[PDB]
């Protein structure tokens, strides 16, 4: 209401925090590929900081076991740690969906 | 009404998937356990199904109305409420049928729980 009719309010309100359902919906749309803009809570950041490391740990195994223990190619052409962690987190958060087969 | 003397048995899956089947047998074979190999969608595999040894004051509309009106013998309803509460139910999130017990003013908005 405030956003659509700013003229109706003498003093503009403050953005409220989302609940569990809305946070899940926003994170779901982020996977779809919509630019989501909202403040993140602390419980999610805390959990993700560990989840990313866990997923990285699991990924490394598959790499090293095979034999490819050391990376190759140009240093300026390989992926970054943040991108790798984001990709692993997205893969993890879509294991129970049909979209995994398309990967 | 039906005059059938046939007993009612209950076959349960061996996988603990909460899968059950319905059938009938003769009354003479009272002390006989039935075991089959049926499809179980819970595991997408053929599993064993064994006959289970399946074994109170009933509540009617009249009784319900009486209770609700007078307020006598409310423990019968309170026991069901406690059971429901104990079991996974009345959850704030991911629930439409009965997300909450009552509204702020003390009302049950969901007709079908």
């Amino acid at each position: 209401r405030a956003h659509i009719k700013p003229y109706k309010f003498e003093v503009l309100p403050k953005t409220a925090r989302p609940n569990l359902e809305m946070v899940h919906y926003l994170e779901k749309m982020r996977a779809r590929g919509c630019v989501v803009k909202y403040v993140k809570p602390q419980w999610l950041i805390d959990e993700e900081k560990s989840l990313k490391t866990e997923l990285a740990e699991f990924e490394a195994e598959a790499l090293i076991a095979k034999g490819e223990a050391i990376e190759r190619g140009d240093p300026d052409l390989r992926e970054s740690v943040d991108d790798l962690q984001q990709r692993l987190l997205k893969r993890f958060r879509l294991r129970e969906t049909r979209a995994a087969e398309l990967l | 009404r039906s005059r059938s003397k046939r007993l009612f048995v209950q076959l349960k899956s061996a996988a603990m998937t909460n899968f059950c089947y319905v059938t009938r047998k003769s009354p003479e074979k009272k002390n006989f356990r039935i075991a089959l190999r049926k499809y179980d969608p819970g595991v997408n595999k053929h599993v064993m199904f064994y006959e289970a040894r399946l074994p109170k004051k009933q509540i009617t509309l009249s009784l319900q109305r009486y209770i609700r009106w007078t307020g006598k013998q409310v423990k019968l309803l309170l026991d069901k409420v406690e059971k429901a509460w104990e079991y996974g139910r009345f959850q704030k999130y991911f629930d439409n049928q009965a997300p909450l017990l009552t509204d702020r003013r003390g009302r049950a908005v969901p007709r079908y729980k």
Partner: protein, 188 residues
């Protein structure tokens, strides 16, 4: 909501229609008169029924039936000795609720003197307090020991001598009559 001490918790924040159409036969048990806002009764105004008055109740069976019946309060006859009035008050209709509050207050004179009118719910107690203050004001008349009901009216307080005179006169008359009545039917 507001006024939690009073009945009708679930009736204030509702539609006007609900309030207007509210029925009285929907309540089985009685409700306190103070909480319900019921008007005092004539029998209560003539006694000391602190939290007691005529109430109503309804019944209900398994057949969804309902009725309404009247119920009377519990009243007792006793005697109280008032030191300030200097006269006995026989046959005082009281109740256990008032009796209890008398204990708390300290007695019969202090109960009447230190009870607010809204809690007393009795005009007879206000008249007795008035008479007590009149005796306080006028010790001389206090010595006579006449019944407290003689000076109940304001005109009797304005003219106390006349009141005692008339009381004695009428007592004389009554006894005179009685004597004759008896002598007429005397056996001997």
């Amino acid at each position: 909501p507001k006024n939690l001490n009073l009945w009708g918790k679930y009736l204030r924040l509702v539609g006007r229609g609900a309030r207007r159409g509210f029925k009285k036969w929907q309540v089985i048990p009685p409700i306190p008169v103070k909480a319900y806002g019921r008007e005092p009764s004539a029998a209560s105004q003539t006694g000391l029924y602190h939290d007691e008055d005529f109430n109503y109740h309804t019944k209900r069976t398994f057949s969804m039936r309902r009725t309404r019946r009247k119920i009377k309060p519990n009243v007792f006859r006793r005697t109280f000795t008032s030191s300030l009035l200097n006269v006995t008050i026989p046959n005082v209709r009281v109740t256990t609720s008032a009796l209890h509050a008398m204990d708390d207050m300290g007695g019969f004179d202090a109960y009447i003197l230190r009870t607010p009118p809204q809690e007393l719910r009795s005009h007879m107690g206000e008249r007795m307090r008035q008479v007590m203050y009149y005796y306080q004001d006028q010790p001389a008349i206090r010595d006579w020991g006449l019944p407290w009901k003689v000076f109940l009216k304001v005109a009797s307080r304005r003219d106390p001598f006349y009141a005692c005179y008339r009381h004695n006169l009428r007592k004389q008359q009554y006894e005179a009559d009685l004597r004759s009545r008896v002598r007429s039917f005397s056996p001997y």
